[PDB]
C-alpha cells in the first residue's frame, strides 16, 4: 500500500519537492505554490484519510511515516524536500526525525512542533474528540463553519471562510475523522529537543497575521519566513510570497 499522489516530472537529476497539505486538505493544497518550480520534481501527497488515500486508515505517525516512505520509494524519489502545511508540517517533522532516506531539508509551515505538558495533552484530546463526533454525526458545511472559527483561523474574512467551506466540504467525515485522532498533536512528542540536533536543514513559515505559530518559530532553532499579509494557510493567502521564500531557501 502507497498513498495516492500526484507527480510532476522536472529536471532530471534535481531534488523532488514533496508537498504536505492539512487537515481536510488534499492534493491539490500545494500546487498553486509547487508549479512555480517547475524545474524540480513535485510529489503532491494525499495523507491518510485524505483525497485519493482516504481509505488508507492509520494507527498513529508510526504508520503515516511508513506510509511515506513506501511511497517514496515507489515513485523513485532518491533526493528530497519535504514540504508540509499545519497537520502536513507535524507529519513532516515526526517522519524527518524518525528518519527518511534521501531528505536532504524539511520546510514547515504553521506545524506545531508539540504539547509540553499532560494538561495541554488532555485538552487537545478531548477537543479532537468533540471534533471527531462532529465529524461522524453532523453535516460537513455546518462542521466546516464552525472550523474555520477557531482561533488559529480568526484572521479569516467570511468570504475566504465561505470559500473554504465549499472546498473542505468536499472530503469523507469518517474517514477525515480517524485520520484526526490518529495524529492528533495530544499523541505528539515535543520535538524541539530533536529539530535542535537536526541533520537535516529546517526551515519554518508563518503567516504575519498568525500569532500562535508566529510564538512557536521563536522557540525553535529554525530560520523563520514571515509571510505578509497573510493568517495561518499562508501559501494558500499569499501563494506569491510563499513562493519567493521557498525560491530563497531552495536555490541557496
Ligand atoms: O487548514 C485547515 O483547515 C486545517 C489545518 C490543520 O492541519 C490543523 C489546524 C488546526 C488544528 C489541527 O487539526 C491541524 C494541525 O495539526 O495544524
Known sequence: MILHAQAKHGKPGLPWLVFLHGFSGDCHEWQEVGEAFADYSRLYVDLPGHGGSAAISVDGFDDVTDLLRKTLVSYNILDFWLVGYSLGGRVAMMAACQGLAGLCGVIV???????????????????????????????????????????????????????????????????????????????????????SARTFAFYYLCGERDSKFRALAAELAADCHVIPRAGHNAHRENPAGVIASLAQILRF
Not at 468570504?159 to 492528533?184: I, K, P
Open 109 to 195: 509551515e504553521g506545524g506545531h512542533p508539540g504539547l509540553q505538558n499532560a494538561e495541554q495533552r488532555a485538552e487537545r484530546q478531548r477537543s479532537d474528540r468533540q471534533w471527531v463526533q462532529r465529524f461522524l454525526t453532523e453535516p460537513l458545511t455546518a462542521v466546516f463553519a464552525d472550523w474555520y472559527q477557531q482561533p488559529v483561523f480568526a484572521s479569516l474574512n467570511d468570504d475566504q471562510r465561505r470559500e473554504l467551506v465549499a472546498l473542505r466540504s468536499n472530503n469523507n467525515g469518517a474517514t477525515l475523522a480517524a485520520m484526526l485522532e490518529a495524529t492528533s498533536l495530544a499523541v505528539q512528542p515535543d520535538l524541539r529537543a530533536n529539530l
